[PDB]
Amino acid sequence: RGSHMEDFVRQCFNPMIVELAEKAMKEYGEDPKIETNKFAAICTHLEVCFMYSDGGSKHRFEIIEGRDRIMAWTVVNSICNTTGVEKPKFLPDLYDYKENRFIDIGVTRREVHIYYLEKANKIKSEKTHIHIFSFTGEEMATKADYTLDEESRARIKTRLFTIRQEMASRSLWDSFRQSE
Ligand SMILES: COc1cc2c(cc1OC)CC(NC(=O)c1nc([C@@H]3CCCN3C(=O)CSc3ccccc3Cl)[nH]c(=O)c1O)C2
Numbered sequence: 001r002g003s004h005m006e007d008f009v010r011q012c013f014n015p016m017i018v019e020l021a022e023k024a025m026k027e028y029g030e031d032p033k034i035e036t037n038k039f040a041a042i043c044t045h046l047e048v049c050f051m052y053s054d055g056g057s058k059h060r061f062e063i064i065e066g067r068d069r070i071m072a073w074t075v076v077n078s079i080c081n082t083t084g085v086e087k088p089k090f091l092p093d094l095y096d097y098k099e100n101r102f103i104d105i106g107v108t109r110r111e112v113h114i115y116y117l118e119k120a121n122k123i124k125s126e127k128t129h130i131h132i133f134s135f136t137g138e139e140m141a142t143k144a145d146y147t148l149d150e151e152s153r154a155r156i157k158t159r160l161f162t163i164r165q166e167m168a169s170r171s172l173w174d175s176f177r178q179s180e
Pocket residue numbers: 024025028030038042045065090091092093104105106107
């Protein structure tokens with residue numbers, strides 16, 4: 001029962017990101033062929049995380065998203081037992097070696113305020129930095145500290161709005177926005 005959303009996801013994101021998203025969905029018992037809006041959202045989240053790691057210096061960020069559950073937690077404990085940062089209760093997306101903190105990146109179709117509120121109470125980790133991006137071009141980070149310079153963030157927001165235009169041109173945006 002191949003959907004229009006599935007074929008769009010594959011010719012919109014690069015094969016390596018599609019591969020990682022398929023593995024992440026299948027690991028937690030989900031099928032990219034059926035729950036296709038979630039397939040698109042994980043690909044989007046993965047690409048943003050990768051563009052985000054690109055923004056800093058060469059060795060600024062340790063990428064934890066995109067790893068399997070076991071190795072991702074292995075890297076977290078290595079970072080904790082080396083830098084003394086508190087071990088987060090839930091998996092973050094990156095570690096900032098410059099600012100010495102874990103980052104969880106959020107990509108939402110709702111208002112940045114609402115999504116941020118939920119990620120704060122859910123993570124419950126006082127130390128984990130939070131950075132939210134929306135498909136409309138707004139962002140919101142912990143303590144108003146946006147980590148990267150403006151140009152690296154603007155590149156992410158441009159890509160996010162391009163993705164939304166591409167789904168809107170194929171009439172899949174409405175079903176995607178109504179899926180979150
Ligand atoms: C399936 O259960 C869990 C899975 C995972 C975690 C925890 C889970 O519960 C025990 C940690 C990790 N989640 C994130 O890294 C993360 N998750 C989100 C959103 C809102 C919070 C839950 N969520 C999901 O997507 C869950 S489903 C899912 C997740 C990844 C791949 C495939 C699927 Cl199907 N938003 C982010 O910005 C973000 O970084 C993977």
